[PDB]
């Protein structure tokens, strides 16, 4: 129904194009565009074999890949001048984060029993600070519940708002008298620099999500 629904469809179709005509029918030699999707493959091969390496790392390799690419595409599309809050609709992003965090907590409880609660015993510290370190390990464990979502959401939301707030101000700079319209381009160049930074930090955040929910999974699969 919603505007949001239409843009979620647009994201799906963009991702399809990355493995349908970005590919040169799957050319062994590799095309200029398909080389890109090789390098992404390699840095996530070497990252999620590196993070969640072990007996199972490839078993969670599609999951971490669809968390990379989704955020990778959704922080370019949302950075188009007219394009709707998907990642600035935080309620979807944070919910997805909590779901994955719960799917780690459940995975850990299920796979590693009630000695999953040994994850919240960090070490064999002296006995008078053992109970304290259970309390503020579980606390930090469900601070991990909300941190992952709030990272991506805040970055994207703040970026769009910063650009828009400055756009309205420089509009009124170029609406007031011509001595201000001379030196009307100088603040504009600042907004351009900010737009460059916001595109950059969205890809940086895109790597940061997928390493963090590899890191939480590193903690969950391999006890402690």
């Amino acid at each position: 129904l919603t505007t949001f629904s239409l843009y979620t469809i647009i994201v799906l179709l963009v991702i399809t194009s990355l493995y349908t005509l970005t590919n040169n029918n799957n050319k062994i030699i590799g095309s200029r565009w398909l080389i890109s999707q090789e390098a992404i493959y390699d840095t996530i091969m070497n990252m999620t074999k590196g993070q969640i390496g072990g007996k199972n790392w490839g078993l969670y390799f599609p999951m971490i890949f669809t968390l990379f690419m989704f955020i990778f595409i959704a922080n370019l599309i949302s950075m188009i001048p007219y394009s709707f809050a998907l990642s600035a609709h935080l309620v979807f992003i944070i919910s997805l984060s909590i779901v994955i965090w719960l799917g780690n907590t459940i995975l850990g409880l299920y796979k590693h029993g009630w000695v999953f609660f040994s994850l919240f015993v960090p070490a064999g510290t002296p006995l008078p600070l053992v109970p304290l370190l259970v309390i503020i390990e579980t606390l930090s464990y469900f601070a991990r519940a909300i941190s992952l979502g709030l990272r991506l959401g805040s970055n994207i939301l703040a970026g769009h708002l910063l650009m828009v707030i400055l756009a309205g101000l420089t509009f009124n700079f170029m609406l007031i008298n011509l001595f201000t319209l001379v030196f009307g381009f100088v603040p504009l160049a600042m907004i351009l620099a900010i737009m460059m930074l916001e595109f950059a930090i969205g890809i940086i955040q895109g790597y940061v999500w997928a390493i963090l929910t590899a890191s939480y999974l590193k903690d969950a699969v391999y006890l402690h």
């Binding site: 647009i10 005509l21 970005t22 590919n23 040169n24 029918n25 050319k27 062994i28 095309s31 200029r32 565009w33 890109s36 599309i77 188009i80 001048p81 007219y82 394009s83 709707f84």
Partner: protein, 85 residues
């Protein structure tokens, strides 16, 4: 005395060396080899096989499709701006 019969017996030199393995590979691969491969992608037709051909072929990766793809989404919301305003 009378020579032995090994020099005139051969029957396991054909597993005896490594290029035998390569041989049985490349008799299949090369015998049924094509002179050239099939395609570097070409489908997207509807007056858009040209769009892919100009922009998303191995010929070039340049910023022209990016601009085009960006502009489609801009055209959607820009028109909708006046639907909202």
């Amino acid at each position: 005395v009378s020579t032995l019969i090994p020099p005139k017996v051969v029957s396991s030199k054909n597993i005896g060396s490594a290029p035998n393995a390569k041989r049985i590979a490349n008799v299949v691969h090369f015998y049924k080899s094509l002179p050239q491969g099939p395609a570097p992608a070409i489908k997207a037709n509807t007056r858009l096989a040209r769009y892919k051909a100009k922009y998303f072929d191995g010929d070039n990766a340049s910023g022209k499709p990016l601009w085009h793809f960006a502009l489609g989404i801009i055209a959607f919301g820009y028109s909708m701006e006046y639907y909202f305003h």
